[PDB]
Amino acid sequence: NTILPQTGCVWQSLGTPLSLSSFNGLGVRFLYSFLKDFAGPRILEEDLIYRMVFSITPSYAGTFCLTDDVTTEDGRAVAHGNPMQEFPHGAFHANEKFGFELVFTAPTHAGMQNQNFKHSYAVALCLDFDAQPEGSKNPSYRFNEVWVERKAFPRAGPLRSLITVGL
Amino acid sequence: NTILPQTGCVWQSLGTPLSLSSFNGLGVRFLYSFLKDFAGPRILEEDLIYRMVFSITPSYAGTFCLTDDVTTEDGRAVAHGNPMQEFPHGAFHANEKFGFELVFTAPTHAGMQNQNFKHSYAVALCLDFDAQPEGSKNPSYRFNEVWVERKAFPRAGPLRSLITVGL
Amino acid sequence: NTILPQTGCVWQSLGTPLSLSSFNGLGVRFLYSFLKDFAGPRILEEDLIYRMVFSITPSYAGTFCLTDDVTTEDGRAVAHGNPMQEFPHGAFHANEKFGFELVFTAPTHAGMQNQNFKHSYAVALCLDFDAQPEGSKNPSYRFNEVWVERKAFPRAGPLRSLITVGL
Amino acid sequence: NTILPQTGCVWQSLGTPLSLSSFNGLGVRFLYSFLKDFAGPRILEEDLIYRMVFSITPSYAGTFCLTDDVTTEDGRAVAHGNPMQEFPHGAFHANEKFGFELVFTAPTHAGMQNQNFKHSYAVALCLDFDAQPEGSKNPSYRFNEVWVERKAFPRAGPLRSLITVGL
Amino acid sequence: NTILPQTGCVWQSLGTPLSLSSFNGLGVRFLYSFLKDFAGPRILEEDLIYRMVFSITPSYAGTFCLTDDVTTEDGRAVAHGNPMQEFPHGAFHANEKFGFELVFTAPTHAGMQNQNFKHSYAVALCLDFDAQPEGSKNPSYRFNEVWVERKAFPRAGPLRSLITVGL
Amino acid sequence: NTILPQTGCVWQSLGTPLSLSSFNGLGVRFLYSFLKDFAGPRILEEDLIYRMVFSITPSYAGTFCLTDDVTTEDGRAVAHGNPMQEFPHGAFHANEKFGFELVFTAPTHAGMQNQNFKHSYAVALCLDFDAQPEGSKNPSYRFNEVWVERKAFPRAGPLRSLITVGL
């Protein structure tokens, strides 16, 4: 029924949905913007990340890809490069849900340390919207679920400081 | 740092805060009203319940107790009986946080099945507010945390149906 | 001298006598009305019940039987079906004592869970009084003893909270 | 939750409450008056008695003690001696509950045979009430619980003579 | 030739066909309405249910699904929610036979106790009929077979009470 | 509670009641007329039959017996021979239920093959009604239960062809 984790790993959810705008025909969002928001326990610089799973609902049609080259000079991201070919890509229709999973690896081991997603491994997620009518409206999009696979940590409980009265 | 569960148990949280009113000088809330709201997995009729932990913030001063006899005839609960003496009781001040833990047991085993909290084991939680001024305002109260200790179930993950595109 | 219980069971008494009326020629009383009154420890929904023993003293003559079909539309029970043939039946005389024992079983094990006596196993006890004189008086009846066979629980003692002074 | 009995003993209750009067400023009651009233099985002359537990609710203030010397000449007990110092003693307030436990021993073994509480071991319980107003009212007192610890006997059951009809 | 049961289970049939009406464009029937009708032996509250198999013949075209949310306010069921995705769904044509099998499970074991189909697991079966002509006729439907998989119980035989004469 | 089958046998019921007429003072029915109607699985020519159990309700008084000689020339059976003395016989009253069991054997083994009940082992069942009033009414009779003991065959299930839709 659910995707199973590896031998010593667990899954963790982001917790809240989020909505963004088109902002000049395409939307770009770096993977380190998502990773700095998990808060059950936070993620440290040297923590290995194994997988990620997404779920988006757009309001138009277009294509998506994962790219490393992103050209921008002020605010808006204006252009990007060619899709990388170890991460999925494809096209989507309006008001339909699509989702994918990413796998991360290093030349000598499985996983990637959290600090590397900011130096030398700065992958981004780009959505391309096609139509260009004069009278129009910026096609927005909304994230419904974000998951990350980490090393196993203990389950949450209640704090002893909660108990003031006694028996 | 946190309260540890028993040998084969786990903790589970209710998820959202809630606020109620005084409603004629005292507030009563049966424990089966709380138990029908847990939703990670739901609780079934024959599931054993071991403990509970609470956290409330009132807006006046008074006393609290756990009682089995509750007299009511329409809507409002008007009067209650004497506090049971295997569950805590005490007094609280205005705008201060107090919390306690409950333990449940049977004559032959530890725990209590969920269905019994509605027949023959219908415990309630009662808050008594003292002052009676003519010009006044119904002292409200707010729950900040509710936890229950259950049998161990597997951790949540993402659903395979989330993935539409592929590599 | 006394009836012996099974290998891991004990007997328990109801504690108090009770008297009822004829109420239109016959009296009906469901077995779940008796079982909700035992109070040494109370009985829970999933507790297995093995046997029962009764003792009644009527004030007229008639017949008794255990039946599952009972027709009633408001208050009074007006008519019943045919006696079941795994439970006793017979006739009685006025101001004489009669008593019997019942045995309960399931298709795969001995006993019956307490909750079932309310759904799909709702047996009732019916007393039929014969005479129909114009000038008359409702023949009453009185229970002298009720016993149930349960799983073994520990004997009653005194509570530590009883002792205030010390040596 | 409850006081545990010794290795081969059981507890037994007296069954009914009882109320007495002050009767000239103090009330005296010998322990053999209580012991001749237990009736589940009765107590025989050579049965060893181990402990006793009491619970009283008075209607005034005063002191209580266990004494062996009691002076009386007709009806009323008029004066008593000094409290023994292997049994508790203390003071009590009006309309409050107090209780204690007694331990009995012999120079060579634990316990005391029932017949001795009448010859050479005739302990009594005395309640002293203090105030002496002209306009007054005899301070009464009421026993709420009496328990005795005995040798183990089998649990009560129903009698075979109860069953007249059959299957 | 036939579907095989699990290691310690048996199949049982409902015995009789049944016909219903459309009643404002859709028909809803809770699974606990079917389960209270098996009568070879009846089903008790704590009996585990493993599977079910159906067979229906409609008189129009439409779709079917299993849903937990059903909105109704008096008699008629007026609207329902979204189909659950662990139970089948699809479309059917007029005067053709379709059938399916359901599987039930819990977070820790296989099966579901009979009492849960009424609290917190109240699944329903809904049939949607499409056409809306002014001159029309309520599309009826008819059940041809209903089966349930249970724990093994012994085969039926004749009762000794049948034999009156002898050799 | 029920009659137990032999070491490798099972019981099977006929399924439906049936009513017949008196037809000139006596009714005759050969045992092969009953055996050709069982239909769960049908019975083959070489299948061994061990026992049979009956249950009839008449509308008059008379006698019954099992006989091999039956004289008839057209339709009606007019006369029969003497009762066999390895099968029961007796008398019955009006509107009362009577029933019996038959045992079948061969000179070298237990049982009798189904084909033999038509050649050389053609037993019949005859009911004799006594009264002969001019103004009268043909005394009818009705079978309530018929059972046969066979070799063990597997329990019924549902057919795979029932399932058209899928998950």
From Swiss-Prot, chains A, B, C, D, E, F:
**One of the record's GO cellular component terms:** viral nucleocapsid
Q: Is NADP tagged as a keyword?
A: no
Top-level taxon of the source organism: Viruses
Where it sits in the cell: the answer is: Virion
Keywords tagged on the record: Acetylation, Capsid protein, Ribonucleoprotein, RNA-binding, T=3 icosahedral capsid protein, Viral nucleoprotein, Virion
* This protein's record includes keyword Cytoplasm: no
Q: Which GO terms describe its molecular function?
A: RNA binding
Q: Which family does it belong to?
A: Belongs to the alphamovirus/ilarvirus capsid protein family.
Protein purpose? Capsid protein. Binds to the to the 3' end of the nonpolyadenylated viral RNA and is involved in viral RNA translation initiation. Probably binds RNA and plays a role in packaging.
User: By what name is this protein known?
Assistant: Capsid protein
- Source organism per entry reads Alfalfa mosaic virus (AMV)
Species lineage = Viruses, Riboviria, Orthornavirae, Kitrinoviricota, Alsuviricetes
